[PDB]
Every structure is written in C-alpha cells, then in structure tokens.
Design a protein around this ligand. Sequence first.
Ligand SMILES: CSc1nnc(-c2ccc(Cl)cc2)[nH]1
Lengths: 10, 31, 251
Amino acid sequence: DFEEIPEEYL
Amino acid sequence: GEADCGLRPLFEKKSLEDKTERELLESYIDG
Amino acid sequence: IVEGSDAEIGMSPWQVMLFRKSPQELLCGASLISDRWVLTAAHCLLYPPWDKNFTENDLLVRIGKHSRTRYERNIEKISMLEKIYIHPRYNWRENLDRDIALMKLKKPVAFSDYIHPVCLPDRETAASLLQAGYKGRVTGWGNLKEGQPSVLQVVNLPIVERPVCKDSTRIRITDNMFCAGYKPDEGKRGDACEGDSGGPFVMKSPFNNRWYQMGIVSWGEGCRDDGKYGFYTHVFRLKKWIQKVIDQFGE
Ligand SMILES: CSc1nnc(-c2ccc(Cl)cc2)[nH]1
C-alpha cells in the first residue's frame, strides 16, 4: 500500500 | 521550550492564516 | 480522521508518522517537540493485550509528510530512534491513564517549511485554553470511517465538560484525560479514528499566536464519530515527566 522508502532507512 | 516553537513557516512566519484557524479563535470566548 | 478535511501544505509541520519497518505500515501519529524529541501515545508502543511491545529498531518516524502512502522526496525526512521512553505509570491494564511516550531520534532532523516543532503548554496557557467549548485541532492519517485518506486530514473539535465526558462511557476517566467532540444536537461532527492515535490535539494561543500541544489522541469507543467522545492525554499534567526525561537523557 505504501511506497517503498529508501533502503538506507531500513 | 524551543524559542521558535509553534510558529509555522508557511503560515505564522509569513503572516498567512489557514482556512479554519479562525474557527478556533472564535471559540475562545475567554470563558 | 472522520469528517475532516484535507490539511493545507505546511499546516501541521510538527506532525510525525510512526512507521513500522516490516511490514511497511502506519502505526500511529506523533508530534515533533524539538529537533530530536517526538511525542506520542504510550499505547502506540506498548499494549500487551494486543502483543504490542515495539523496540527502537522496529520503528521509523517520518516527518514533514502530507501524502499518507507516497515517499515525499525532497520534502519528508525519515529518522531512526535512539531510545523509547514510556511513562512509568502508563496504565495499559485498565484505562490508558497516562498514555504518553517520548522517542529520542538518533540524529537531529533539519527544520524546513514542512518540519517544525509545536510548543508544549505552560500552566497558564493550559489553564486559560483548556475549557469546555474551546476548540482544538486534531490531525492524522487514520481511517475516514469506523476508507483511508490520500492526504493528512484535519478537524477542529470542541473540548467537552468533564461530567459529559464521564457520562458517555463506562470507562473510568482520570485527570490525565480530557474528551472532545460535538454533541448529537450540535449539527457538526468529527473525531479521530484508527491510525490517528498518538497524534496531536493542538490549540492556537490567542495571546502569543503560537500553536500548543494540549492533548495526544489516546482512545475512543468507535469513531459515534453519537453520544461518544474522543479521549486525549492531558499533556500539561504530565509535563514534569516530559521535562525530567528530556533534561536527563537529552544532550
Ligand atoms: C485503534 S481502533 C480505534 N477506534 N477508534 C479510535 C479512536 C477514536 C478517537 C480517539 Cl480520540 C482515539 C482513538 N481508535
């Protein structure tokens, strides 16, 4: 549902 | 607290009012 | 937010989204009170009846957002948490008494047109503004009905007389809570709902033109949004806890 956030944040 | 707190860059800082803040002011019938 | 409107851009620049890493989902609202402290409801982080007990690494905060689902490149900032602090007397067993928590960010967030802290009230601001009839404002990305919004929603609701709050419910109401919302006769409606909790109930001071956070969206019984009211954590009453935590654990 949400847009993929940058993987740096994960 | 923060010296600049609660003053919005796109509203208070430019002296622009949002569409319904006045509804809040109108209710503060200081009583 | 039920029966709200779309927020204007930059209308609530202290609004924070509490975001679950995996799976990617909105947990709750929250608010920015300085460049490294975020305020929310304790039950957003710790609620044993639902097997909720998040650690720092399960969570992100997203600051400066308008759109619920979009990654707002160049606008929003996503921060990791250094430490969660739950009020030591938060009552999850009974009534969510003292439903408040603080989150310290790993690094200070940069303020911008879209990102800016709200004030915490002083005794005198609270005494003057926390009155029946006086309207505050509630914002969040929660459900529109007891489906989901494209953008941040906003609604202004009146604070309600304490006896009316109490007579609306079987839950024991404490001094660390107030309720707000319209009465069935009053012809206007609105309430927070699923996803909105931990977000801010703010009021604009007529004295110094500054927005203050008076409440945190804590709980309700549906969203009846006839004869029911949303309950908010009474922020000034718990401000000494807030200051203790910040003074001790903030740099
Ligand atoms: C978490 S499910 C839910 N249903 N209603 C709410 C709600 C309604 C009003 C407030 Cl003030 C808070 C939560 N939450």
